Design a protein around this ligand. Structure first.
Ligand SMILES: *C(=O)N1C[C@H](NOS(=O)(=O)O)CC[C@H]1C(N)=O
Ligand SMILES: [Cl-]
Length: 253
């Protein structure tokens, strides 16, 4: 029905296609959609090459796997936390087909895109719940639904083997575990509570062996990378922190 197909083309061009990605919300411009419209051998469709470009660019713009994260810190205002293990990436070919299908349906819509990674793009990467590790002030907070639920001085890694910055997360929890390391070569360390955040096996754990925790102590008594924590505190922390909670670690540019 050419009559019907042309009415289809009208509708399609007039669709309000809205994306919600990492918190930002926006509408795909009507001019971009009229561009993409096609009609060939009696079939209405969209120019895949062009739609795929658009979706590729969404990736370039928004992907938390390749774009750092602006973070409102506790002591320093808005800082930039670099990419880490807690991230996601838009799957270009899946999203391209999904977006075409949505648009050719010709009904107004909102979507967040198809991604692969630690969470989805339907919400901002960081929300009201997270662990903040301010490496400069050498101090750590656990925020839960907006409010600080616990805080403490810590000891980061020594300057030869420093704690890296990035948007990390608690990917596992383990009790009475025993960690392996290197110095001239092999060594060990038993720990009551262990929460890794990184793929090189950085993580947050208790320290019997650190007598005090604070400001300068890291320069001489620093760790191999991990975040040494008061044992009375670390227990109480492991108690309240769900697996999957993000951990933001940062120091001064
Ligand atoms: C964390 O950086 N690691 C885990 C483990 N514990 O470190 S600590 O005893 O210095 O606090 C061993 C070293 C290191 C690693 N390379 O896994
Ligand atoms: Cl991995």
């Amino acid at each position: 029905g050419l009559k019907e197909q042309l009415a289809s083309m009208n509708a399609i061009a007039n669709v309000k296609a809205t994306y919600s990605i990492n918190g930002e919300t926006f509408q795909i411009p009507s001019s971009d959609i009229m561009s993409w419209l096609t009609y060939n051998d009696g079939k209405v469709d969209l120019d895949t090459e062009q739609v795929r470009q658009y979706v590729t660019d969404l990736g370039t713009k928004y992907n938390t796997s390749t774009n750092d994260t602006k973070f409102k810190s506790t002591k320093r205002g808005e800082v930039t936390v670099p990419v880490g293990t807690y991230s996601w990436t838009i799957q270009t070919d899946s999203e391209t087909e999904a977006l075409k299908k949505a648009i050719l349906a010709g009904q107004d819509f909102t979507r967040s895109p198809i991604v692969q990674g630690g969470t989805t793009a339907d919400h901002p990467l960081i929300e009201d719940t997270y662990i903040e590790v301010d490496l400069e002030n050498q101090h750590m907070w656990y925020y839960k639904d907006g409010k600080v639920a616990l805080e403490t001085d810590i000891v980061s890694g020594k300057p030869t083997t420093p704690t890296p910055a990035g948007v990390f997360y608690v990917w596992n929890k383990e009790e009475d575990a025993t960690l392996k390391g290197t110095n001239g070569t092999p060594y060990e360390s038993p720990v009551n509570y262990w929460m890794p955040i990184d793929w090189t096996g950085v993580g947050i754990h208790d320290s019997d062996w650190q007598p005090e925790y604070g400001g300068d102590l890291w320069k001489t008594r620093g760790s191999h990378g991990c975040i040494n924590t008061p044992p009375s505190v670390m227990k109480e922390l492991f108690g309240m922190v769900e697996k999957g909670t993000p951990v933001l670690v940062f120091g001064s540019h």
